Symmetry: C2
Subunit: 407 residues, 2 copies
């Protein structure tokens, strides 16, 4: 509508448009970093979610990548949205989507923000504490409420009491307390997360929330909404893959949450939809030769025009492991050297890749980072003055075919 979105010409991929944009500027300085973002890649992901998880409705986790072009490609596709604040509710609201396709799945919400949702038609929210019930009572008394339980399958480093998620015990309590309040609680949500070594944590999650529905029942609560959260992998570059996890989800849901029981099942995927769709191209702006060990080569330092304050904040906050790629075509069979790769800022710890093997590169060559769509442009700033890469959005004729059925 106001985003570029360039249909690919008939033989062309998203990789080809990368090569075109780098060739355009071959002679003419302005070598700023840029992305190529394949909205065709995202419409493939949704088709694949329909086959893999036919009972589960996908609520896109907006925080993952809030670009307006992405939400609206997804809003035309049938997804709901998981939204955590007044500006994400407003974003999705302005893109035409109804009340009924949002869950406000932040367990701990400011009271003015609770009040905003209720004034704008938004009713389903999550919670996991007494103060929160307390707040809703006061500010959204007719809200439909999903209780969030603890899972496991890793947390990053020992520390004591976790951010979100009730015990079964505290849920016993929280179900009663809401009963005191006349607040309708309709379901259970958990969130395993993308540091899942082991798919049976889902089953365990699913089993733990039979318990809590059955604890809904003894108090008088009639619950149907099952939310199994996010954390599904967004590329093929992971060891546990999407369909390995979903093999174990499905007969879990079959044993514990039979369809003839009336249940509705949603989830909140974020990186699954967008991670592989974005490729980042960055320019080599500066270069040091280290005459190394105490036109003359042994180890290398390369500086590029996006870093850990920009797109590579992901290596800090999201634990990403990034992989530098060349799109110089490989030579005959070229020597590699031990190298490091640095961001543009004046900060000694703006460092992207502490050690890797690369061929010798020169100022003005391009490096590529694939799988950079999730938790990347969403959390970047412009610290030190360095601007955000411009994103070019593209689509094949065949993915537009795919789009063009449902809307």
């Amino acid at each position: 509508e106001e985003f570029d979105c360039h249909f690919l010409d008939e033989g062309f991929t998203a990789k080809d448009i990368l090569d075109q944009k780098i060739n355009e500027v071959s002679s003419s300085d302005d070598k700023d970093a840029f992305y190529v973002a394949d909205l065709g890649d995202i419409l493939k992901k949704h088709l694949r979610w329909l086959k893999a998880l036919p009972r589960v409705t996908p609520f896109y986790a907006v925080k993952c990548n809030d670009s307006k072009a992405i939400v609206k490609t997804l809003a035309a596709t049938g997804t709901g949205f998981d939204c955590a604040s007044k500006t994400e509710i407003q974003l999705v609201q302005s893109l035409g989507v109804p009340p009924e396709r949002i869950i406000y799945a932040n367990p701990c919400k400011q009271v003015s923000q609770i009040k905003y949702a209720a004034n704008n038609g938004v009713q389903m929210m999550t919670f996991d504490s007494e103060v929160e019930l307390m707040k809703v009572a006061r500010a959204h008394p007719k809200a439909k409420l999903v209780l969030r339980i603890a899972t496991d399958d890793s947390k990053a480093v020992c520390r004591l009491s976790v951010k979100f998620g009730a015990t079964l015990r505290t849920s016993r309590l929280l179900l009663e307390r809401a009963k005191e309040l006349n607040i309708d609680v309709v379901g259970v949500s958990f969130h395993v997360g993308s540091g899942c070594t082991d798919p049976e944590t889902f089953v365990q999650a699913i089993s733990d929330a039979r318990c809590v529905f059955d604890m809904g029942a003894e108090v008088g609560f009639s619950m149907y909404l099952l939310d199994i959260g996010g954390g599904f992998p967004g590329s093929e570059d992971v060891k546990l893959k999407f369909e390995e996890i979903t093999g174990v989800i499905n007969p879990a849901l079959d044993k514990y949450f039979p369809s003839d029981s009336g249940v509705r099942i949603i989830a909140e995927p974020g990186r699954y939809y967008v991670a592989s769709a974005f490729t980042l191209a960055v320019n080599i702006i500066a270069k040091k030769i280290v005459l190394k060990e105490q036109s003359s080569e042994q180890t290398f330092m390369y500086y590029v025009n996006d870093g850990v304050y920009g797109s590579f904040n992901c290596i800090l906050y999201d634990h990403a492991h990034v992989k530098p790629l060349l799109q110089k075509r490989p030579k005959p069979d070229e020597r590699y050297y031990s190298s490091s790769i640095w961001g543009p800022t004046c900060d000694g710890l703006d460092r992207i890749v502490e050690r890797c093997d690369l061929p010798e590169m020169h100022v003005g060559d391009w490096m590529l980072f694939e799988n950079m769509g999730a938790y990347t442009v969403a959390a970047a700033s412009t610290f030190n003055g360095f601007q955000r890469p411009t994103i070019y959005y593209v689509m094949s004729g065949p993915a537009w075919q795919l789009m063009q059925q449902f809307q």
Copy 2:
């Protein structure tokens, strides 16, 4: 102006404005986080700088806190500006500073941004490598270059490469190489940085800089410009205070770089000018109680700013923040082991792993002093959560000092 700046009334202060403003808000909340920023505290810092380091002209490191009101205040006050990018040069030149009060002190610059500098009259730049000299020889061959040398100091962690700074051996090759490209090198810079434990690191870097000046002379440079970088502490709450650093520096400058030798001595303070000036107030928005311990005694409090907004400083700048009660105590009130968390959907958006606080309540305010440096400047709006609005205040007496500096003021 355009931004939100107010003058104080006489015996009324920045901490006084803070107290008031949380006490106008009390009902129909929307109780969003906010800063009070005292521009008069910047004028204090400047007068103390000119007293403590009389030979040293300060060039403000813009990246520390680029708020336009902070930069316009510093420009009228007369500082130079350390700029690292095209958008920082633009900001300062949009305030009317001349190019001569800029140093483009980023050693590794994108070619296009080097050309922007040369098209806009900014002549003085830093460098530390032979590929940088190549780039300058093509895009800005009359620049006046300043050679950035390696410094010492001991650490957090011990790793394969340091990003900036040539060694003494590298420096001699760089100077011969400049001289063969007919590029003018006019001086030396270094940066010790805000985790110096030992002020003697300044004494060693200053001595190293005199060794590169003499290497210069041997191949035919007349070097005059010494730049001692940044790192000075921005608040009184640090083991190593400002005037202790300045009291080793001063005698080493007189030893290695006497006034009769021609030299001009600058520095690049960033957090020194702005850290203490900003106090941030955040609202408790949520709370959870954790009883008797298994693997009411404890509380967990959720506030509306976090590690993605203003408290990115605990990740990128190693900051240690110190939660302050403002709700004025209760005599000996009973305190509890306590955790504080940001607003995001993220299980690592935590601000303080354990404090001891008195039981508190949704809707109460918690205060964080000295939050001006490396905070707002690196904040994002991840998860849709918005940046705290800043309120600028200044005293009538700070405004007149600023005018007595207010700084056309000099040449011939």
